[PDB]
């Protein structure tokens, strides 16, 4: 059968078609019945059109009879069926239609029988209410017209060629004219016949199916209209056909919108077809710019792509305001749309388009700096660079021009760059260098875990080599020029991390290393900004790599720097801490400055040869004895002592360490914890926060986990926290994290960090799990802010001990009920928001026990037994008959009554009987209703 | 029967006219990527996994950092 052969996909369609054409020539009715049965069977209909039906019945009655005989196992029709066999079927169906027209193009198509029969059947099935028939019949008619457009295009080519010959004949002047004139007449009858067939499909199927309820049928029609106007633009690119695309651009479904954009991009690839699309662009330019910010990002990508195509053909159509909206898409969170916007920006301000400031890309670098400054959406250039990376690689990787704009002097006639423009260029250069050296996009703009290809690795190596050679000489010069500016110095000091250090010894550029080291030493001795000092310390660590031969030189420089800093600290402290006298603000400024620098270098560098614990302990001890020590000195002294104790623990790993070292470390760590506990009660909030962070960290490092992993020599160094410290740490969290509901978003991140620290101590069994009750009770009230941290803590604790977590959860709900009865009092309404909110946390907590219902039997049973005793605890002072105080609490417990397995249900009621008399079993709404609910929850 | 028979085969002219008037349901605003360098770093080190894996006080040497990461089990 025809359908079966097309589905099998074994024979060539031309053989299938030629076989049928041979059969049609023998008897036409037999062949047309088979062609008709094909379209009906390609919809899934297992019925047959008998010759008697075709000869006597009408198309409408046949479709009715076929609907009744459509055996159906699923609502899936061939074109909906998923699978590779069915993907082959779609292309096989479309190809059969094309081949049939191609083969019957010169003779059968003009017989007034076949095409009319096919178009009539297709139009009838395109009006059917069965999606199977309509979808299939629409696809067939749409493909038939694409094929008929081809015959019209071929007929037009022949008539133009024939007409050209007729002009020549009359010019040269004949039976030649007569025979040529007959060709013209014959081709006109043929062209008229094809146009009539095409209008029948357009006015019978397309006019109605472009508005079909099902989006799939609408997209089929939109796709085909694009093909026709691209194929035969001289008869299909008028506004009477383009009007349909404009209306469908406003479609609710994005699949259909994507097809409209793709159809219009096909027309803009040819620049000749411009005069026709000009009026349409003018009317719908607004909608296309609006589709850039589309809910579906895929449609957005195509809209920016189509605007880029419009920019190429005609630039005046888009006004600056419209272009500005697209420029704002460079800083988008979706890389695909940002990359598409980068291409539009490249083709609008950069693509349009000697060494140094005179270099060819100098103007384009200045143009990019001007754009970043005129767009106050972002303060860093990371996303602008990532978006324009695949398009402006030459400009972005031209670091000689960028370095010449920052170091070389302005040419006569060139206006200088302002400090803001120079700061902008340094941000752009650092960003280009980072993406070149580390071939990964910024956060949010990629997975960041792609295996690099061979070319990617070769590109990375050549980029790093070029970066190292150029900035090995330039970085010293740049730091000397912008040393006073903290923002500029911070950015510039990050460059050495992206360098091939071996280039210094393979390239004899060691004199440049000496200069880089001097400027870092110079900046440290002049700046007090924490970020400048963090950069200097981290740059030194990168340079201090024992895998590179340059290590000896950089170790000498680091040692010389710490020698000077430590010497000054010791001589300043001897006079600052002198018993008596008064502390000049000058002395404290000098002390804070030197402590700040040492704390920075102590985080990444050892510095243990310069014993600093004694100095830091004296400063902190004086604050506890006097009380007037500047807050900032206290913060830096606490941080520095943390690093002193941490660097000593790293050296003890070597068995070469004696018991004196372990015993000295224990005494030093124990003294520090007491100093931190004192500042946790300080009046300055910053000092309280610093002490908490350092204490939480030191308690994790010096915990029982220091003995795990075969490190049993560190058993003497384990520090267990006392109940006093545990209570003080909880007080800080309940006062500085759960407070009364730009700086807001920053304070959120700081408070989230502080909460994570305490939660880490609970999940690593450093502090008791009963302390988590306060955090657990604040789940719902602070869900938008700390919910993730609390949920992680609850999950982690459930793995440590489900039974203990169950008890911790009940205490939190027990605590919130106590607070309501402290305000609303015992006589409170059971419809109040506070009770209702408390009832809501119970529902959420119940949801977290569902996992492993057969493994959480003991935890849920404990919850009930723990809460039953809280409800029946304080007896009614009025009388031993009036309901018990807090009896209302069991209304909160009723929520967990579902998780109890039926066998566990019976046992918990037995526990209830012990706290309930048969007299207590009296029916009243007088607070006796609460208990009735919990009893009824467990009874069924 | 399981045959997908559809009573409404086309869209109404009021629906088409309404779509040509309002397109708010299918448009949206701009999602800007981390605007400040600190917000970029918080996107990298501000998630529950990173918070429960990294120290509260930044450690810039991996030797000092290993002392904390060794205790995270």
Min Cα–Cα distance to chain A from B15, Å: 10
Question: Please, what's the largest Cα pairwise distance for chain B?
Answer: 72
Q: How far apart are CA A824 and CA A832, in angstroms?
A: 9
Question: Which pairs count as long-range contacts for A189-197, CB under 8 Å and 24+ apart, including other chains?
Answer: A190/A110, A190/A155, A191/A152, A191/A155, A191/A156, A191/A159, A193/A109, A193/A110, A194/A109, A194/A148, A194/A151, A194/A152, A194/A155, A195/A152, A197/A115, A197/A119, A197/A148
Q: Do A775 and A729 touch, CB atoms closer than 8 A?
A: no
Q: Do B59 and B68 touch, CB atoms closer than 8 A?
A: yes
A765-799 residues labelled b (16+ CB within 10 A) or e (exposed)? ebbebebbbbbbbbbbebeebbeebbebbbebbbe
Mark yes or no for CB contact A70/B3 under 8 Å: yes
Backbone angles phi, psi at B5, to 5 degrees: -95, 125
Q: Do A636 and A599 touch, CB atoms closer than 8 A?
A: yes
Helix (H, G, I), strand (E, B) or coil at A58: coil
Min Cα–Cα distance to chain B from A706, Å: 6
Mark yes or no for CB contact B39/A745 under 8 Å: yes
Q: Give B48's contacts in chain A (Cβ within 8 Å).
A: 756, 788-789, 791-792
Q: Which residue has the tokens 């023998």?
A: A26
Torsion of CA A346, A352, A358, A363, to 10 degrees: -50
Mark yes or no for CB contact B67/A650 under 8 Å: yes
**Chain A interface, best mutation among B2, B45, B51, B62, by max A CB count within 10 A:** B51
Q: How far apart are CA A62 and CA A117, in angstroms?
A: 13
- For B48, name the nearest residue in chain A, comparing CA atoms only: A789
Min Cα–Cα distance to chain A from B14, Å: 12
Helix (H, G, I), strand (E, B) or coil at B5: strand
Q: Do A752 and B51 touch, CB atoms closer than 8 A?
A: yes
Q: How far apart are CA A418 and CA A425, in angstroms?
A: 11
Q: Do A497 and A438 touch, CB atoms closer than 8 A?
A: no
H or E element in which residue A448 lies: none
Cα within 13 Å of Cα(A405), Cβ side: 28
Mark yes or no for CB contact B36/A379 under 8 Å: yes
Q: Which residue has the tokens 């292309």?
A: A91
Mark yes or no for CB contact B51/A700 under 8 Å: no
From the centroid of its chain, how far is CA A304? 20
∠ CA(A160), CA(A161), CA(A166), 5° rounding?
90
Q: How far apart are CA A37 and CA A34, in angstroms?
A: 5
DSSP states of A685-742: HHHHHHHHHHHHHHHHHTSGGGGTTT-GGGGGG--PPPHHHHHHHHHHHHHHTS----
**For this experimental structure, what is the resolution in angstroms?**
2.9
Who contacts A310 (Cβ-Cβ below 8 Å, separation ≥6)? A268, A281, A285, A288, A317, A318
Tokens at A288, concatenated: 């296309």
Q: How far apart are CA A118 and CA A568, in angstroms?
A: 99
Among candidates B5, B17, B54, which has minimal Cα distance to A133?
A: B5
> The domain A1-209 is classified under which CATH number: 1.10.150, 3.40.50, 1.10.287, 1.20.58?
1.20.58
Which among A131, A252, A650 has CB closest to B6? A131
Cα within 13 Å of Cα(A315), Cβ side: 7
**Chain B interface, best mutation among A46, A756, A775, A797, by max B CB count within 10 A:** A756
Residue boundaries of the structural domains of chain A: 1-209, 801-939
Q: Give A211's contacts in chain B (Cβ within 8 Å).
A: 10-11, 16
Tokens at A150, concatenated: 């081809």
**Chain B interface, best mutation among A40, A123, A444, by max B CB count within 10 A:** A444
Mark yes or no for CB contact A129/B7 under 8 Å: yes
Q: How far apart are CA A624 and CA A635, in angstroms?
A: 13
Mark yes or no for CB contact B25/A294 under 8 Å: no
Torsion sign (Cα): A180, A186, A192, A196: negative
Among candidates A486, A479, A370, which has minimal Cα distance to A420?
A: A370
Tokens at A163, concatenated: 């007409």
| Distances from the Cα of A625 to the Cα of A580, A590, A622, A673, A692, angstroms | 13, 22, 5, 17, 21
Radius of gyration over alpha carbons of chain B, in Å? 27
Residue boundaries of the structural domains of chain B: 33-73
Q: Do A598 and A565 touch, CB atoms closer than 8 A?
A: yes
Mark yes or no for CB contact A331/B72 under 8 Å: no
Min Cα–Cα distance to chain B from A349, Å: 22
Mark yes or no for CB contact A294/B40 under 8 Å: no
Min Cα–Cα distance to chain B from A804, Å: 19
H or E element in which residue A140 lies: helix A131-172
Helices (H), A269-330: 275-290, 297-313, 320-327
Who contacts A900 (Cβ-Cβ below 8 Å, separation ≥6)? A860, A861, A864, A908, A938
Q: How far apart are CA A831 and CA B1, in angstroms?
A: 50
Q: Give B65's contacts in chain A (Cβ within 8 Å).
A: none
Q: How far apart are CA A521 and CA A524, in angstroms?
A: 5
Who contacts A612 (Cβ-Cβ below 8 Å, separation ≥6)? A566, A569, A598, A602, A640, A644
Tokens at A562, concatenated: 């710490």
Helix (H, G, I), strand (E, B) or coil at A337: helix
| Distances from the Cα of A96 to the Cα of A12, A13, A107, A703, A818, angstroms | 10, 6, 18, 76, 79
Mark yes or no for CB contact A639/B57 under 8 Å: yes
| Distances from the Cα of B54 to the Cα of A342, A603, A765, B49, angstroms | 36, 15, 17, 9
First vs last Cα of chain B: how many Å apart?
59
∠ CA(A561), CA(A567), CA(A568), 5° rounding?
95
């Amino acid at each position: 059968m025809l359908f079966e052969v097309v589905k099998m996909g074994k024979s060539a369609m031309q053989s299938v078609v030629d076989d049928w054409i041979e059969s049609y020539k023998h008897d036409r009715d037999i062949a047309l019945l088979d062609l008709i049965n094909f379209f009906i069977q390609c919809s899934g209909c297992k019925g047959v059109v008998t010759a008697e039906m075709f000869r006597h019945m009408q198309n409408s009655e046949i479709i009715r009879k076929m609907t009744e005989e459509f055996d159906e196992d699923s609502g899936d029709y061939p074109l909906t069926m998923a699978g590779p066999q069915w993907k082959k079927f779609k292309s096989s169906f479309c190809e059969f239609i094309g081949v049939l027209v191609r083969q019957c193009q010169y003779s059968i198509i003009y017989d007034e029988y076949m095409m009319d029969t096919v178009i009539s059947l297709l139009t009838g099935l395109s009006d059917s209410q069965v999606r199977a028939f309509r979808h299939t019949s629409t696809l067939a008619a749409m493909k038939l017209m694409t094929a008929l457009v081809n015959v019209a295009l071929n007929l037009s080519i022949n008539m133009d060629n024939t007409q050209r010959q007729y002009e020549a004949e009359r010019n040269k002047m004949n039976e030649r004219l007569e025979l040529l004139l007959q060709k013209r007449k014959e081709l006109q009858e043929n062209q008229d016949e094809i146009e009539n067939m095409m209008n029948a499909i357009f006015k019978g199927v397309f006019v109605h199916r472009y508005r079909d309820a099902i989006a799939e049928i609408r997209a089929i029609c939109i796709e085909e209209i694009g093909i026709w106007m691209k194929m035969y633009s001289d008869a299909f690119l008028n506004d009477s056909y383009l009007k349909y695309v404009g209306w469908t651009m406003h479609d609710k479904q994005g699949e259909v919108r994507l097809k409209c954009l793709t159809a219009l991009q096909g027309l803009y690839y040819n620049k000749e077809l411009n005069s026709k699309l000009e009026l349409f662009t003018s009317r719908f330019k607004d909608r296309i710019v609006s589709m850039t910010l589309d809910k579906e990002y895929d449609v957005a990508v195509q809209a920016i792509k189509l605007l880029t195509l419009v920019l190429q053909s005609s630039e005046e159509v888009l006004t600056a305001e419209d272009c500005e909206n697209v420029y704002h898409l460079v800083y988008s969170a979706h890389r695909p749309v940002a990359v598409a916007a980068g291409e539009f920006l490249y083709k609008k301000l950069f693509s349009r388009r000697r060494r140094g400031r005179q270099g060819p890309n100098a103007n384009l670098v200045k143009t990019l700096v001007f754009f970043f400054l005129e767009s106050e959406l972002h303060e860093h250039a990371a996303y602008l660079v990532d978006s324009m990376w695949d398009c402006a690689t030459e400009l972005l990787k031209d670091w000689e021009c960028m370095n010449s704009l920052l170091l070389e002097e302005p040419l006569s006639g060139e206006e200088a760059l302002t400090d803001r423009q120079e700061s902008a260029l340094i941000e752009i250069m650092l960003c280009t260098i980072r993406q070149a050296a580390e071939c990964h996009p910024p956060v949010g703009r990629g997975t960041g875990k792609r295996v690099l290809t061979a070319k990617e690795k070769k590109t990375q190596l050549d980029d790093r080599t070029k970066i190292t050679e150029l900035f090995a000489v330039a970085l010293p010069q740049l730091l000397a020029k912008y040393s006073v500016d903290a923002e500029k110095v911070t950015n510039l000091l990050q460059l050495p991390q992206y360098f091939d250090l071996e280039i210094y010894t393979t390239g004899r550029l060691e004199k440049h290393l000496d200069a880089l080291l001097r400027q870092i030493r110079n900046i440290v001795e002049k700046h007090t900004d924490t970020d400048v000092l963090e950069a200097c310390s981290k740059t030194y660590h990168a340079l201090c790599n024992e895998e590179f031969t340059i290590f000896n030189r950089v170790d000498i420089s680091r040692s010389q720097l710490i020698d000077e800093l430590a010497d000054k600290f010791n001589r300043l402290l001897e006079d600052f801490l002198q018993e008596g006298e008064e502390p000049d603000e000058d002395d404290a400024y000098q002390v804070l400055s030197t402590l700040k620098r040492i704390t920075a270098f102590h985080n990444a560098h050892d510095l243990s040869k310069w014993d600093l614990f004694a100095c830091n302990y004296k400063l902190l001890k004086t604050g506890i004895e006097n009380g007037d020590m500047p807050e900032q000195i206290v913060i830096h002294a606490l941080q520095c002592t943390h690093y002193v104790i941490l660097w000593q623990l790293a050296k003890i790993t070597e068995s070469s360490s004696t018991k004196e070292d372990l015993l000295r470390l224990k005494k030093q760590m124990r003294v520090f914890c007491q100093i931190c506990q004192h500042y946790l009660t300080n009046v300055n909030t910053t000092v309280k926060e610093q002490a908490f962070t350092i204490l939480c960290d030191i308690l994790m490092i010096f915990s029982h986990q220091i003995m795990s992993g075969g490190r049993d020599m560190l058993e003497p160094l384990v520090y267990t926290p006392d109940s006093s410290l545990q209570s003080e740490l909880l007080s800080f969290i309940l006062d500085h994290v759960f407070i009364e509901q730009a700086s807001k978003i920053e304070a959120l991140h700081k408070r989230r960090n502080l909460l994570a620290a305490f939660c880490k101590l609970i999940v690593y069994t450093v502090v008791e799990m009963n302390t988590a009750a306060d955090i657990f009770k604040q789940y719902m009230k602070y869900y938008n802010d700390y919910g993730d941290i609390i949920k992680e803590t609850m999950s982690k604790t459930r793995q440590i001990d489900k039974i203990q977590c169950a008890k911790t959860l009940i205490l939190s709900l027990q605590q919130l009920f106590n607070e309501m009865i402290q305000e609303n009092g015992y006589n409170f309404d059971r419809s109040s928001s506070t009770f209702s909110g408390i009832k809501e946390l119970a529902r959420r907590f119940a949801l977290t026990f569902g996992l492993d219902q057969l493994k959480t039997r003991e935890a849920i049973a404990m919850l009930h037994k723990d809460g039953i005793e809280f409800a029946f605890k304080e007896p009614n002072p009025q009388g031993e008959s009036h309901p018990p105080l807090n009896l209302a609490f069991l209304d909160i417990l009723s929520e967990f009554s579902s998780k109890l397995l039926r066998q566990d249900k019976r046992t918990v009621y037995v526990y209830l009987e012990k706290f309930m008399t048969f007299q207590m079993s009296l029916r009243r709404e007088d607070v006796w209703l609460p208990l009735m609910s919990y009893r009824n929850s467990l009874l069924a | 029967r399981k045959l997908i028979v559809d009573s409404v085969k086309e869209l109404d002219s009021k629906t088409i006219r309404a779509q040509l008037s309002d397109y708010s349901d299918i448009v949206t605003t701009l999602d800007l990527a981390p605007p400040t360098k600190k917000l970029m770093m918080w996107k990298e080190t501000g998630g529950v996994e990173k918070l429960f894996s990294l120290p509260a006080q930044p450690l810039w040497n991996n030797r000092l950092l290993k002392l904390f990461t060794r205790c995270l089990t």
